[model samples]
Target: NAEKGLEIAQERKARDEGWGDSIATMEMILKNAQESSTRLMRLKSLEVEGDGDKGLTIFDQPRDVTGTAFLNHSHTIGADDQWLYLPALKRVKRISSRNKSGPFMGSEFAYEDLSSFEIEKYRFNHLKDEKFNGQDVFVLEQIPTDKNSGYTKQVVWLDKAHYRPLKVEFYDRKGALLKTLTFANYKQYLDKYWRAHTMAMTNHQTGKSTELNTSDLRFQTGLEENDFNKNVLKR
Candidate 1:
C-alpha cells in the first residue's frame, strides 16, 4: 500500500511539471476574532531542473508591508533557503530554519507553507479511500522529514481522477489537529496542470484563517535563475 501511495505522489508531481515559469497577482485576506486585514501581492515562480522550484512574493499594497518581498528556494533535499526584504528597515533578513513554524506576515499559514511542496520533503502512507464532496479521493498520511517542521503529520485528500490535493489536515507537535487547508476553483493551465484559484487555511487552535485569492496567473513567462536571487529582492 505504501508503494502504491508513493507512485501516486510521483504521478501528481509529474503532471505538474514542465510549466517553465509563472506570474500571478493575488490577494491574501487574514481574518481573526477581532477583525480582518488584506494584503495585495504579486508572485513569481521558476521551475528548477533537478530541484524544488524558486518563488518570490512581493507585497504591493497596504502601507506597512508595501515593497516588502519574500524569496525562497525550495529543494528536493536538505533544508530550503528563505529571505525577506523589508523596505522600512532597508535590510534583507534571512529566515532562520528554526523559525519556519511561525506565521507568515500574521497569517494562519506558516512560513513553511509558503514553500513549494517537494516530493522528497515527506514520507507517505496510504490511509484510506473515501468520497470527498462526491469525488472519490485517496487519503494519505504524510510525515515531514524536516526537524524544524512544526507539524508532526499531515493528512491529505487527493482526488482519484487527477490526483490533485483537495484538502490537507495538519497535526501539531502534540499530534492534535491544528489547521486545515482547502483548495478550490481549480483552473487547468497549459491544458494539463491544474492551479487552484482560491486556497483557504484555517487554524483550529487560534480561530483564525487566511484566504489566498489568485486574481490572475500566467505560465511560461520566461523567468530565469537570476530572477530568484536574493539580490533581486531589493529590486
Candidate 2:
C-alpha cells in the first residue's frame, strides 16, 4: 500500500510543476543551491538518549502506519510558509500563513528557524583559523538579515579540511545565549561529502539536549519542487 501510494504521489508531483512560474522556479533554484552545498543532517534529543547512542533522523520524510512522521526532502526552497505534503490523507497542504516562530516537529527548532542560506540571508565574516576537536577549523559568524528572525546571530566552527560544520552557537533575538550544537562521529560519503552521523543541540535555558542520527542516505531520486508544494499537506 505504501509503495502504491508513493508511486501515485510521485506521479502527481510530476504534474503539478505549473503552480506559479516565478515562485516555483525561484524556490527550485534556492533548493538546488542548498542541496549542492551540503549533503544531509540528523537531529536527536540528548536528554532522552543519554550519550547519544539512540535517536531519530527527522529530515528523511519517513512514513509508516502511524501516519507520515517527518518530511526530510530538501532545505533549498525554505520550510516556513513554503511547503507541506500530507501523505496520510492523500493531499497537499500549502502553508497559507502562520507564526514563523512556532515549533517544528514539536521541538525547539522553529519552522522559520533553520537557515535557508541565500547570499543575502545573512551577512558573513570570516573570523579566524583555529583548531577544534583536534582538527583545523575555520570560524565564521553569520548575522541574520531577516529582522523578524527568532535568532539574533550565530557562529559556526567549520572543519577547514572537510568544509563540515563542527560546532555552532545560536543567540536569541535579544542577543542572549540560546543554544549550542556540536557535530561528531563524521563518516565520509562519496569520498567528497562528509556526513555527520551524530549531533547534539543543547538548550541554554532549559539545560536540555537534542541528538540526531541519520541512515539510508541516498541522492538524486528525481525529486521535484511540486512534491514540496502546499497542496501536499492534505495528503
Candidate 3:
C-alpha cells in the first residue's frame, strides 16, 4: 500500500539523519558499448539542518579535466541548484533546472541523479516483498513530482533489514526502461548510517554505464557552508 510505502520511506530518512559532513575519493568509470574511461574525483558533502544536503565534487585526475568542479545544493521542495567550474575558462556556470536531466560529466548519470534524495521529491507505493541478491527486500514504486524530471517512475529494491536501496530501475518519460542502478559493498558508518562503496548505473537503451567506486570515506569533516560557495569553486 502507498501508506505503508510512505511510512517506510520516512523511517529510512529519519534513520539516516545527522552525521554532519563527509568526504570521499571516488573513481568514476564510464563505459559505452564500444569503449571505457575513468576519472578521479573527491566528493565533499554537508548535511543541511532543515533542507536537503549539499555536495561539492572536484576532479583531480586526467590532466585534461583536472581542476573541474561541481557543486550541488539540493532542496526538498523545489528544484536543486547546480554549478560547474571550468578550469580552462576560469569561470563558474550555473546549471539550469531544465537541463538537470542531461548527463553528468559525459557519464550515464544525469545531473538530477546526483542530487540528495528527499522524501518529498517522490510519491511511493509498496509493490511487494521479494528476495533480491539472496536477501529479503521490499519493492517500491516511486513517481517523481517534478514536472521537469526526466524519469516517469523508478522502482526501488530496498533491503528489508537495513532499509537501504540495493537496486533501482529508472523509466523514461515515455514509460520505457532507461537505466538500472545497483548498490554494492555497503559499509555502516557511525554505527548507524550505511553508505554504498560502489554504485553502478547502466543505461539500458544506449548500452552505456557508469561505475562510481569510493574510498577513504571520512565523516564529520568540519566542512562549512562557505566551502560550497560558487566564488571559491575555481579555487
Candidate 4:
C-alpha cells in the first residue's frame, strides 16, 4: 500500500514537471480572529531539473514593505536556502534553516511552507480513498524528513483525476493539528499543469489565517537561473 501511494506521489510530481517558468500576481490577505489586512505582491518561479524549484517574491503594495523581496533556492535533498531583502535596511539577509519554521511576513505561512514540495522531502503512505467536495480523492500521509520542519506530519487529500491537492492538514511536532490548507478554483495551464486561483491556510492554534488570491498567471516567461540570485534582490 505504501509503495502504491509513493507511486502515485511520484506520478503526480512527474505530471507537474516540464514547465520552464511561471509569473503571477497575488494578494495576500492576512486575517486574525479579530481583524483583517492585505498586501499585494508578485511571484516569479523557475523550474530546476534534477533539483527543487526556485522562486522569487516581491512586495509591491503597502509603502512600508514596498521593494522587499524574498528568494528561495529549494533542494531535493538537504536543507533549502532562503534570503530576504529589506528596503529599509538596504541589505540582504540569509534565513537560517533553523528559523525556517517561523512565520513569513507575519502571515500564517512559514518559510518552510514556501519551499517547493519534492517527493524526496517527505515519506508518504496511502491512507485511503474518499470523497471530498463531491470528488473522488486519495488521502495520503506525508512525514517530513528535515529536522528543521515545523510539521511532524501532513495529511493530504489529492484529487484522483488531476493529482492536485484539494486539502492538506498540518500536524505539529507534538502530533496535534496545527493548520489546514485548502485549494479551490483550479485552472489548467499548458493543457497539463493545474494551478489554484485561491488558497487559504488557517491556523488552528493561533486563530489566524492567510488567504492568497492569485491572478494573471503566465508560464514560459523565459526566466533563467540568474534571475533568482540574491544579488538581484537589491535591484
lDDT of 4 by residue, 1-235 (tens): 7897899899889889898899999999999658898899999999998989999999999897789999999999998989999989789999999999999999999999999989999999998999999999999999999988999999999999999999999999999999999999999999998999999999999979999999789999889999998889999
C-alpha-based local distance difference test score of model 4: 0.94
Give the runs in model 1 whose Cα sits over 4 Å from its true position.
none
Candidate 3 lDDT over 198-227, as tens digits, reads 999999998899999998799998899999
lDDT string, candidate 1, 120-150, tens digits: 9999888899999889999998889998999
As a whole number from 0 to 100, the lDDT of residue 208 in candidate 3 is 91
lDDT of each: 0.92, 0.48, 0.93, 0.94
| Model 2 Cα lDDT, one tens digit per residue, 1-235 | 3343233333323332222211100000111212321123233211111111111222332233223222332232233333434445764443322445555444445555432233335566667778987998767777766665677888878765566678888898889999887888787544444556666677788665555545444433334455443343344
lDDT of 1 at 58: 98
RMSD of model 2 against the true structure: 15.7
Better of 3 and 4 by lDDT: 4
Model 4 TM-score on a 0 to 1 scale? 0.98
In candidate 4, which residue ranges exceed 4 Å CA deviation?
none
Q: Quick one: how many clashes does candidate 3 have?
A: 0
